[PDB]
Amino acid sequence: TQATLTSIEVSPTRASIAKGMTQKFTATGIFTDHSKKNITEQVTWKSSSKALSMLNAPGEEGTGKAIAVGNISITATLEKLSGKTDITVTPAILTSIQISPVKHCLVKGLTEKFSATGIYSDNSSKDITSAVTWHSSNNSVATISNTKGYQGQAHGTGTGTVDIKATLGNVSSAVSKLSVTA
Ligand SMILES: [Ca+2]
Ligand SMILES: [Cl-]
Ligand SMILES: [K+]
Ligand SMILES: [K+]
Ligand code: NA
Ligand code: NA
Ligand code: NA
């Protein structure tokens, strides 16, 4: 309380966040006694553009939400002093994969086309059937192709049940239970 505030630093200094994701900013107060203090909950936060929304709800103080791709300047203000930083919003990232059909009954000797829908960090979606790698837990029940022009093509090779899944980098679809009948 004896110390006067002399500066505000906002961290991080450079950062990238995917569209639809969020970032917690920190406001660090610098004082005449050379102490540093977390003043994130005390400062006034603002953003230079709609592309990053500073969240207003209690407990969200200093949280920015990526609305649109671009460059945004962020400011923390207290006692007419301001600290600033820059953030970059990058394109939405793959967060989940939904495969269809969710379950299926296939007659042996027939072929069924599975599709993979990528769900992104802004909850946009895309057909990524040809981009994913398709997997079968048991080729003796069904095979599934990754061959160009046949991606997601599942062929009933024998009776039973099998797990079908799609993967793309570190993202994996839910398992689809494929039953093959005679
Ligand atoms: Ca900074
Ligand atoms: Cl940046
Ligand atoms: K806003
Ligand atoms: K997933
Ligand atoms: Na600003
Ligand atoms: Na915008
Ligand atoms: Na069989």
Q: Which residues pair with 107 in a beta bridge?
A: 181
Ion ligand 5 neighbours (CB, 5 A) are 46, 48, 73, 75
The span from the CA of 60 to the CA of 10, in Å, is: 16
The span from the CA of 77 to the CA of 38, in Å, is: 13
The topology (CATH level 3) of 94-180 is: Immunoglobulin-like (2.60.40)
Angle at 46 between CA 25 and CA 94, to 5 degrees: 55
Helices (H) and strands (E) in the chain, counts: 0, 21
Name which of 144, 7, 132 is nearest 76 in CA terms. 7
Centre of ligand 6 to C-alpha 146, Å, is 38
Angle at 152 between CA 174 and CA 132, to 5 degrees: 60
Centre of ligand 5 to C-alpha 46, Å, is 5
Sign, CA torsion 16/19/24/25: positive
Residue ranges per domain, the chain? 5-90, 94-180
Centre of ligand 7 to C-alpha 160, Å, is 8
Q: What is the CATH number of domain 5-90?
A: 2.60.40.1080
Taking the CA of 107 as reference, the closest ligand is: 7
As given in the structure block, the two tokens for residue 90 are 């990058």
Are the C-beta atoms of 174 and 164 separated by less than 8 Å? no
The verdict on whether residue 132 carries a ligand-binding annotation is: no
The span from the CA of 78 to the CA of 7, in Å, is: 9
What is the 8-class DSSP label of residue 102? S
> Which experimental method was this entry solved with?
X-ray
Ion ligand 7 neighbours (CB, 5 A) are 158-159
Domains 5-90 and 94-180 share a fold: yes
Are the C-beta atoms of 113 and 153 separated by less than 8 Å? yes
User: Any idea which residue has 């992104």 for tokens?
Assistant: 120
- Residue-wise burial string across 52-66, b where 16 or more C-beta atoms lie within 10 A, e elsewhere: bbbeeeeeebbbbbb
The span from the CA of 25 to the CA of 42, in Å, is: 13
Ion ligand 2 neighbours (CB, 5 A) are 14, 86, 88
